[PDB]
Symmetry: C3
Subunit: 315 residues, 3 copies
């Protein structure tokens, strides 16, 4: 069975648009905790991290809000490690995707052998020197990869980071808006990815088979799922900062998470980039939040074929 | 070739929302009969069954309108058997899905070796004792399965039922909202199903290959297709009582029916749960009705690749 | 590498609805040329052909505007051959699909061994005698096929045509609205096609594998892609004269074009049937135009997984 530890991370400064800091609020409001308890789930809420304002945080080169982002990730790393040591699956409600530096870092402190599945339209693997936007939500993976040590300058706020994963310990699914330096890094480091072209070619069934065999083939190990709702098509998750057409369908997102649940190895989860302020209508917001909740419930066992308890229902 | 016998079943008391009794009307209004005649089809309209009101019909335990539902199904069974003895494919226009008790029962009187394909978001397999809603459209399959004799109390209106199918003679496609007791029954009886997870994994092509091989592998036999429009995604069939997101696409529904047509074994068909009152706009209604008509025409040979008569068109 | 020669073909008389003659304009306005230059592309604009009015053009039998259509195609054939002799990939911006007579004809003058991929809801293979509509955009393929010589009357405006392709040198993808005489021609001539039924069965991955192996299996040869935006679902390309539900998705259209790009054999391209006047709203127009531009950029190398130049980005 499996214990869950919820962490709200109401944090937006990895990117410019306000509102993503409300994700933990609208996800809770949608009844996530109660719906989780409805399943097999032993659920503990660790609350919303209080990220204090860092008023003096001028860019580093063109990298924006570095001290704010670095410290939020440092704090979240602390908290995720606590949840993990408490023997629970960490569930980070974001918040922008820069928080993955802290979520994966903190997870890896307790489980260094982890493997990551990163579901996103974007690779989020720019370095401080290849970014053109300066937004740290487009860089988290570069901070985490050991191969890119040497390439990450000393950015204020991140002196606490130690790269904890190798290029062979991450798989991307969903990619369709990748910068040229990012694509170079993928090919140079030999990272495993299923862009939307591969999902089209192979079908999500084969994509998950290969994703899981790639990560678990040699031996089982904890899985970290970092799910950016912008990996799904904007027809399902429109309330997000950077929607990109041609995404994963609602079905594909449930398929990915149902298969990860079935491994019994989910160890940490990020549900990121929900930005209620950016829905064009109230219904775009509920659509987005509802989809995120459904993705989350699938991670913890909710199955489209149905579920039952180990009793005899014919009484 | 193939003769068709249309039966309207303007009946709603298997569930609470009025309007599904108008399905036969809007389907006819959309020109179904004429469009069928445009194909190879020898089409006879048996009219709309006149279901008299049963004013005294208080629940049985929590099961609602049992006498009404039982009698409508009894009457429809009578009529479907007549059509079948007339050597025609029965085409039941519903009406809520509780009518499948009568449609499959009546069909089986003439062809006891039939196999059923049930296309639906729901399994509709609660018994009177596992239902929580009391709505009989969520129970028809339990009345039909021989294995569940012993488990179906004597519900008023259904004393005429005799279970006519075994668990191994039905396949579900489309499932994504299954109650716990229903899931227990599926696993306990070893029923064959393709939930949306399986359709995602395998693709609708392989789903139909396996569906047909499972039902026809040992020997050919008549097929009964019970098609609930809520099996399709609400973006195609919104005017229905219980829409569930993440459904079969329009393409997938045509694929299912094109492959069943190609077997030459379609023997009876139900087109159920169209509820024009529930479209949010006139266009949701026409969208739903149009999709239902297209599904129906595919059952009788309309092919997306095209069709021609056995003449030389280059004259 | 690959040089491109853009040709605008603002022409509508292959069908009744005005507005498709504006396709080259809205595609250019959307920044196509600049976006192409952003890729590897050496881009030369050959301008918009000036199609003079032919005021005296009464139907031939029921075939409408034959002299206008024939002459526009004659002029376009001239220009495409020029671009091809200039060692560039011809990119025809339409305009209605009747222009394919000229585009493929002109291409074949320079590369007679070409193979055609025709992406469309329709086969566009009626002859002047099997058409029921009289619209020449529903006939271009019949004019091009050698096997149908004998079956094409002498239509005024087309005396310059010489059939340049065999039935075995075309593959259709996307088909879902095929007339009976057209279906007869497909089966009689043994043309290779993937209707939407086949795309559903096999998946677009296998469809392209088979399409390319069928055309290139025996030996590499130039590819002509004739892309009718109505091959995509109207939820992506609504501003078109004859939308048909159940089409190829945005993903599938990018998949088709990404795979053709990867062959290195794209030799000519048609982007047809964009009709901005027919969008129900301004957003339907931009949606359609945007999709067409994305399809076009994929033909010339834009990849969803990303792209980089052959430099070291980690500097
Ligand atoms: N949401 C998002 N993630 C990444 C981007 C764009 C770009 N690679 C960047 O790094 O800013 N956008
Ligand atoms: N349309 C529909 N069919 C079944 C349901 C829900 C539930 N299983 C029930 O049995 O009522 N809803
Ligand atoms: N756009 C379009 N192409 C073909 C058609 C319909 C019909 N086959 C015809 O030939 O007119 N419509
Ligand atoms: Mn991200
Ligand atoms: Mn993203
Ligand atoms: Mn049903
Ligand atoms: Mn249903
Ligand atoms: Mn066309
Ligand atoms: Mn077309």
């Amino acid at each position: 069975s499996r214990t869950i530890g919820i962490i709200g991370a109401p944090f937006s400064k990895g990117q410019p648009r306000g509102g993503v800091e409300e994700g933990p609020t609208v996800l809770r409001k949608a009844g996530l905790l109660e719906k989780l308890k409805e399943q097999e789930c032993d659920v503990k809420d660790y609350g919303d991290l209080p990220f204090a304002d860092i008023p003096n945080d001028s860019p580093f080169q063109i990298v924006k809000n570095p001290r704010s982002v670095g410290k939020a990730s440092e704090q979240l790393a602390g908290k995720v490690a606590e949840v993990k040591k408490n023997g629970r699956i960490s569930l980070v409600l974001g918040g922008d995707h820069s928080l993955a530096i802290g979520s994966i870092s903190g997870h890896a402190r307790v489980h260094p052998d982890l493997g990551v599945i990163w579901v996103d339209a974007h690779t989020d693997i720019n370095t401080p020197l290849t970014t053109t936007s300066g937004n740290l939500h487009g860089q988290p993976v570069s901070f985490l990869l050991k191969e890119l040590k040497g390439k990450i300058p000393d950015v204020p706020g991140f002196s606490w980071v130690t790269p904890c994963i190798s290029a062979k310990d991450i798989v991307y699914i969903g990619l369709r808006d990748v910068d040229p330096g990012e694509h170079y890094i993928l090919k140079t480091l030999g990272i495993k990815y299923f862009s939307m072209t591969e999902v089209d070619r192979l079908g999500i069934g084969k994509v998950m088979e290969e994703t899981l065999s790639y990560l678990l083939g040699r031996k089982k190990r904890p899985i970290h799922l970092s799910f950016d709702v912008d990996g799904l098509d904007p027809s399902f998750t429109p309330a997000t900062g950077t929607p990109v057409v041609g995404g994963l369908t609602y079905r594909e997102g449930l398929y990915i998470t149902e298969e990860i649940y079935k491994t019994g190895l989910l160890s940490g989860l990020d549900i990121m980039e929900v930005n209620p302020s950016l829905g064009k209508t109230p219904e775009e917001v509920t659509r987005t939040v509802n989809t995120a909740v459904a993705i989350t419930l699938a991670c913890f066992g909710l199955a489209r074929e149905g579920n039952h308890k180990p009793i005899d229902y014919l009484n």
